[PDB]
Design a protein around this ligand. Structure first.
Ligand SMILES: Nc1ncnc2c1ncn2[C@@H]1O[C@H](COP(=O)(O)OP(=O)(O)OP(=O)(O)O)[C@@H](O)[C@H]1O
Ligand SMILES: Nc1ncnc2c1ncn2[C@@H]1O[C@H](COP(=O)(O)OP(=O)(O)O)[C@@H](O)[C@H]1O
Ligand SMILES: Nc1ncnc2c1ncn2[C@@H]1O[C@H](COP(=O)(O)OP(=O)(O)O)[C@@H](O)[C@H]1O
Ligand SMILES: [Mg+2]
Ligand SMILES: [Mg+2]
Ligand SMILES: [Mg+2]
Lengths: 487, 51, 479, 475
């Protein structure tokens, strides 16, 4: 059937007609613009427009296509940048994909799932050690503005090119999806450039719902990304999806709901914000061996104001996630970059999403860092301390100086194991803290020059036998002999 | 003896400074209290008039 | 059966028009012509033979004028021993992928609470195997229990430990209701229940199943589901338990994760149903909607239901209306803290906010009452000395105060213990501490017998003897 | 097409057309009126009725007046003829120098450039200011924000950037005044006529010749309705887009304050029949801003550098307006009142300030390391403020005392006397290059300036001035 526009304003239309409309279907005007029907009132119909409202004219004919709002899926998206609806914006060719998928869908149930056991190598040291991440997990990256969240996510994306290049088994490769809500196109272009400069786009796609783009696209983009990732999840191929920032999506939803004359709630938001984020994040899952064995990891991002996680959106997304990676400005300016607060940051999965070789070191590291955090304040004042307490302070300072990293400079798992071994067994206590930043680098080059076999063995066996232990100890001794530092 | 005299003087100054900080924080607390009341009430009213 | 026509659709709210014979409130309506089953629960009568209903599943795909059929009764859930060993939805449909529920009976989830004349029973003591709980906040066998805490404090782990330590030993049946929790948690719980014999699934050559035994029933309304489902799934599980209480007369165990989600669901739709919001966005019908639930959970002269509710406390604010209202509905309370969990003291129970009606000298003897009150006095004394220690230092404290601080730290570390389900976090094995051992150990520590023993020794130790063994080991390793 | 006014509510007018409606954003002229009242369509309401926002005062309108549809949105002239000339939101010049004889006119409303038509090449600017050159380097071809309350020095900082950049630019420039004082507008006009940025010449026959000018001016000030404040930035953006599209030349755009633009929406949406958001702001607070900012962007054709002063009401940075604006900026500069009370000017908080052009792949590693060491020092000093206020400096150790000394010294050293402040400060201006700043910071951090006093770093620029002042202070 067809209908006619009755009212138009602020990217929203009120129609008269189309009595056979499905709630949530696409609608087409007589000028190419599209819309989505949400409020099926009695007299009129409330449509949200996918673009500017200058085209609609209060009398224009309108037609229903019968399609529920859907997006394309497949490997045709890899290497491409697309909008919320799958339309490309890279400017190079169309999207070669035949199979589509509905945006809003029912998450998978309790039975076709399994526990999280495989890790998702983030490339960082503090995350992969103290706040591990699994495949099928939903871990939040929450912080303030300009603290290193997008950087964490982009390093997670970049670390995968070595793992993917050194195989042709799709069951082991990890594909990636970056959803940019509210960002400006300059930032998205910078991210695309940073990924292309490192050949990290042949396994990624991007979904850009920027600020100039209307509210419905910002509201739909994360669901479009989850739909694109469900192809990997159900096909047996692992994928990780990153949402930057989710809060922007909540703001867009508030805008749409307020312009549809729906009543507000707390902070002018609706009550359906929890349902919005639960709908979105429960689609991340680790499926069973009967459903292929795929996965869809999620790494949402949230920007708090003044570190207030007592707010309305942070509280919800904290209560519906399997972890937290807090980021602070005090730690960011003190010198700790990434600025991960290892106290508040947790991971309910934990060691199950960690390699044994990393377990052996990270347990001791977490214990030592707890003790160091406990006595750090007392130590600053300056009072006589026992040798054991001083040793604790020295080891905590060493480990804190170890977990620092440059931007876009991730590392393999075996190298993290080796470095944290050097840090835990006491080969950094006498050394000057400020010197460690090169002890790391040189040591890495050394074990990539003359000790590739240790790395291959750790990569294959994924553990530290006594033989590899002794070999690594001998390598560290040779390295300290060949080199000299301030202590 | 000099140590104890200086200790008494320092405690005096610290108590005075604490009183000053208490005054400032009391002002801020009352401001935030009024803001909370106004914000909650405006939320309720805006939800009541959008019916 | 009547016949109606959908008139409008706003999120999870659906208006329906009948030509005659309006259905009563709380009745169930079935939409015809939809992809999957879609049930609506009547909520309001508006006028002109129009009603306003709440959808259990997503309204995506609904059409105006689409047809609706009244069932003549509210959402009827199946009941019996056939629900045992089996998972069920809010509308009674199974989601375990094992076959349909061959129940010979159905109960309406909406019922009236037992009257005042149906009195309770004696405050029977419940032994959980947890120390701080059995000591300072004893749980009643026939009363409601609350586990208050924010996010990341150990509510789910504590419920799982209670299941391992109670449900297996319980001779009656048991029920679990997942009200807006994570689905991963449900999968883990189902697998652990199949492992420890609480569920006994036996596949057959003819493709059927056999859940003989399996003294447990599961109901799930998780976050993926919309409002209307999260709200009514608790009533579903409560009716499933009320069947065993009333007819069978067996003692029943009910576990709810989290109850707060049920209240949140109402808020998500209240403004769509034309209600004015309350103080902080919650609905007006908060206390009543929660009390109509809670009063159905109570012991009678036919059976007993022991409930254990985990209450999310957002932003660690106990002044929020939902937990504030829930506090009055509970016999035993257990408040978990973050400041304690930061010290690695798990379970992170605050013994100064946890209370219990049972902690009285007539129910538990004075050896228990005085011990608990002395522990609480000691901990409050240690809490009052915190500022003096922070400003001046330990040098200023007298030897009495130093003894107090030492004993309080030892008590804090001693109330901790490792659970069997937390092996996958700590690696240490689990313990089951009976109550007399706890009372003996607390009396011993408060009397001053163990002042010589080091503070570190009292960590994740089931009993004082274990503490002695750990101290011996630490002293031997010292030389 | 003719139409009738049916309803008037302050700065909103509901009009009724009979035959055919005008689209949204179209301009409408009221005929029975003294001035040239222009109305911008915003909504459609049925019954062939339209809702509009007025670009001028509605005092004198009548229910029944006649309205004429122009068939297109507001049109602002463009070219090198707008240079050296003031122009209000509707393009009408208010310079009292004649009309604008420009050939082409652009619409106020244009779609932003696409994703493919972007070029994020990193460059730097020479502002001459120590704090921004060190800790928040400004990006050539990017957006820059100056956040602050009232009385912290945004306007003075923008004027300093004008004197230190625009005069040494060569290319073109634009200034948009969105709800600022008319006084400072006249002051800027005369300062520009002085410095040669505007080269006005009066011909014998009363005409004028602005040939040689390098700066346009657009002013919608406080003495204007909200509709004439929520459409001025768009006028300036059209004027600058003409340059960086057809001309293909770099341009500098200065906006004072952008927040006023959102404020106008706040005092309009209530009349347009919209439900308010958290703090009375609009539900359209983000799209109305993103549609303005995304038009500002360097592309493959040209580049727009932008310097926006963002008001912060009640010194609350959690307000929705600055919170939304933070996401659109490439560089940031957060001014503070706590630092201005200490007499430090510019009152920049170097910790809340940040930038994207600070990485070592853009600036060197010596610059990056100096900046990060300074930030660490100032954070370590901030962490001791409570214990210093309660107890005192005596409780601190010697390392902490050295830290406090160097932090106070580097705070006072990041204070520059500008040239435009000479009228209320007296001391002459001090342009400062970047390597001198870096050397001075390195020396202060090492410990090569602990012997000097603390008040010797106040308003001195480089270090030679600091040592000379310490010498003179020894007496
Ligand atoms: N490991 C790191 N080491 C040094 N600098 C870092 C590191 N990680 C991030 N940064 C720096 O932090 C600053 C902000 O980068 P980022 O893109 O991550 O911001 P953000 O946290 O996502 O907040 P927003 O995007 O809202 O501005 C950059 O200057 C970046 O160089
Ligand atoms: N007894 C415990 N021992 C060790 N760690 C615990 C314990 N209880 C909780 N934790 C930690 O806190 C996290 C809380 O998860 P959960 O048990 O679901 O509590 P909640 O639902 O209240 O957030 C656990 O994953 C674990 O890391
Ligand atoms: N560098 C400076 N030196 C001395 N005084 C300054 C300086 N900057 C600002 N001020 C003072 O603060 C006031 C700020 O007013 P203004 O320049 O209009 O900033 P804003 O736009 O934030 O209100 C000025 O009156 C001036 O006296
Ligand atoms: Mg970011
Ligand atoms: Mg939980
Ligand atoms: Mg100003």
């Amino acid at each position: 059937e067809v209908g006619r526009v009755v009212s138009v304003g602020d990217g929203i239309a009120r129609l008269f007609g189309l009595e056979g409309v499905q709630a949530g279907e696409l609608v087409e005007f007589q000028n190419g613009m599209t819309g989505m029907a949400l409020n099926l009132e009695t007299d009129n119909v409330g449509v949200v427009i996918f673009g500017d409202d200058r085209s609609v004219l209060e009398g224009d004919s309108v037609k229903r296509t019968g399609r529920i709002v859907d997006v394309p899926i497949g490997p045709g998206l890899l290497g491409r940048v697309v909008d919320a609806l799958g339309n490309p914006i890279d400017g190079k060719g169309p999207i070669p994909a035949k199979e589509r998928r509905r945006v809003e869908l029912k998450a998978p149930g309790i039975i076709p799932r399994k526990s999280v056991h495989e890790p998702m190598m983030t490339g960082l040291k503090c995350v992969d050690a103290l706040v591990p991440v699994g495949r099928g997990q939903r871990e939040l990256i929450i912080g303030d503005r300009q603290t290193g969240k997008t950087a964490v996510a982009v390093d997670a994306i970049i670390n995968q090119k070595e793992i993917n290049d050194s195989t042709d088994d799709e069951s082991k490769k990890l594909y990636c999806i970056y959803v940019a809500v509210g960002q400006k196109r300059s930032t998205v272009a910078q991210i695309v450039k940073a990924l292309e400069q490192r050949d990290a786009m042949k396994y990624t796609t991007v979904v850009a719902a920027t600020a100039s783009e209307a509210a419905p696209l910002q509201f739909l983009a994360p669901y479009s990304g989850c739909a694109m990732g469900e192809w990997f999840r159900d096909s047996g191929r692992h994928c990780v999806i990153i949402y930057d920032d989710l809060s922007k999506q909540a703001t867009a939803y508030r805008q749409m709901s307020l312009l549809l004359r729906r009543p507000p709630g707390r902070e002018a938001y609706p009550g359906d914000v929890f349902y919005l984020h639960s709908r979105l994040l429960e689609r991340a899952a680790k499926m069973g061996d009967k459903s292929g064995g795929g996965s869809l990891t999620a790494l949402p991002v949230i920007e708090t104001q003044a570190g207030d996680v007592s707010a309305y959106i942070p509280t919800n997304v904290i209560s519906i996630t399997d972890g937290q990676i807090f980021l602070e400005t005090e730690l960011f300016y003190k010198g700790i970059r990434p600025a991960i607060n290892v106290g508040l940051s947790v991971s309910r999965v934990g060691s199950a999403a960690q390699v044994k070789a990393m377990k052996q070191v990270a347990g001791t590291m977490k214990l030592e860092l707890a003790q160091y955090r406990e006595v750090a304040a007392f130590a600053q004042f300056g009072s006589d301390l026992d040798a054991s307490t001083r040793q604790l302070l020295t080891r905590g300072t060493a480990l804190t100086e170890l977990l620092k990293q440059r931007q876009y400079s991730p590392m393999k798992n075996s190298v993290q194991v080796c470095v944290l071994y050097c840090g835990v067994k006491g080969y950094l206590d006498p050394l000057d803290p400020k010197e460690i930043s090169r002890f790391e680098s040189l040591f890495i080059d050394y074990i990539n020059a003359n000790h590739q076999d240790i790395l291959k063995t750790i990569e294959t066996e994924k553990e530290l036998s006594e033989k590899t232990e002794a070999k690594l100890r001998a390598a560290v001794d040779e390295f300290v002999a060949m080199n000299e530092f301030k202590k | 003896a000099s140590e104890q005299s200086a200790r008494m003087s320092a405690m005096d100054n610290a108590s005075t400074n604490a009183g000053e900080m208490i005054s400032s924080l009391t002002l801020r607390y009352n401001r935030a209290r009024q803001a909370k009341i106004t914000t909650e009430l405006v939320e309720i009213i805006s939800g009541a008039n959008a019916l | 059966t009547n016949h109606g026509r959908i008139t409008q659709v706003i999120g999870a709210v659906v208006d329906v028009h009948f030509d005659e014979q309006l259905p009563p409130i709380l009745n169930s309506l079935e939409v015809q012509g939809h992809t999957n089953r879609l049930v609506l629960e009547v909520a309001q009568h508006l006028g002109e033979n129009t009603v306003r209903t709440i959808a259990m599943d997503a309204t995506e795909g609904l059409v105006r004028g689409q047809k609706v059929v009244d069932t003549g009764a509210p959402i009827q859930v199946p009941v019996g021993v056939e629900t045992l060993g089996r998972i069920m939805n809010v509308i009674g449909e199974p989601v375990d992928e094992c076959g349909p529920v061959p129940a010979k009976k159905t109960y309406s989830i909406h019922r009236a609470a037992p009257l005042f004349a149906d009195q309770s029973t004696e405050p029977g003591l419940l032994q959980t195997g947890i120390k701080v709980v059995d000591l300072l906040a004893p749980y009643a066998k026939g009363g409601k229990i609350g586990l208050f805490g924010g996010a990341g404090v150990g509510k789910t782990v504590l419920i799982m430990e209670l299941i391992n330590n109670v449900a297996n030993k319980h001779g009656g049946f048991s029920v679990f209701a997942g009200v807006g929790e994570r689905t991963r948690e449900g999968n883990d719980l189902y697998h652990e229940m199949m492992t420890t014999g609480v569920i006994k699934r036996k596949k057959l050559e003819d493709g059927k199943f056999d859940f003989t035994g399996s003294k447990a029933a599961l109901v799930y309304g998780q976050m993926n589901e919309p409002p209307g489902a999260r709200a009514r799934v608790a009533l579903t599980a409560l009716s499933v338990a009320e069947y065993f209480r009333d007819e069978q007369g067996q003692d029943v165990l009910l576990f709810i994760d989290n109850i707060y989600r049920f209240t949140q669901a109402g808020s998500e739709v209240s403004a769509l149903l034309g209600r004015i919001p309350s103080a902080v966005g919650y609905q007006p019908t908060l206390a009543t909607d929660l009390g109509q639930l809670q009063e159905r959970i109570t012991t009678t002269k036919k059976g007993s239901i022991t409930s254990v509710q985990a209450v999310y406390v957002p932003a660690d604010d106990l002044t929020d209306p939902a937990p504030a209202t829930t506090f009055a509905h509970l016999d035993a309370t257990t408040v978990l803290s973050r400041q304690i969990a930061e010290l690695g003291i798990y379970p992170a129970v605050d013994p100064l906010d946890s209370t219990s009606r049972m902690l009285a000298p007539e129910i538990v003897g004075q050896e228990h009452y005085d011990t608990a009150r002395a522990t609480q006095k000691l901990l409050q004394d240690y809490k009052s000395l915190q500022d003096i220690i922070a400003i001046l230092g330990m040098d200023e404290l007298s030897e009495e105060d130093k003894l107090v601080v030492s004993r309080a730290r030892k008590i804090q570390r001693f109330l901790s213990q490792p659970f069997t389900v937390a092996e996958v976090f700590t690696g240490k094995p689990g313990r089951f501490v009976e109550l007399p051992e706890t009372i003996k150990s607390a009396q011993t520590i408060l009397r001053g017998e163990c002042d010589d023993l080091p503070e570190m020794a009292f960590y994740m130790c089931g009993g004082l003897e274990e503490v002695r063994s750990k101290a011996v080991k630490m002293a031997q390793e010292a030389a």
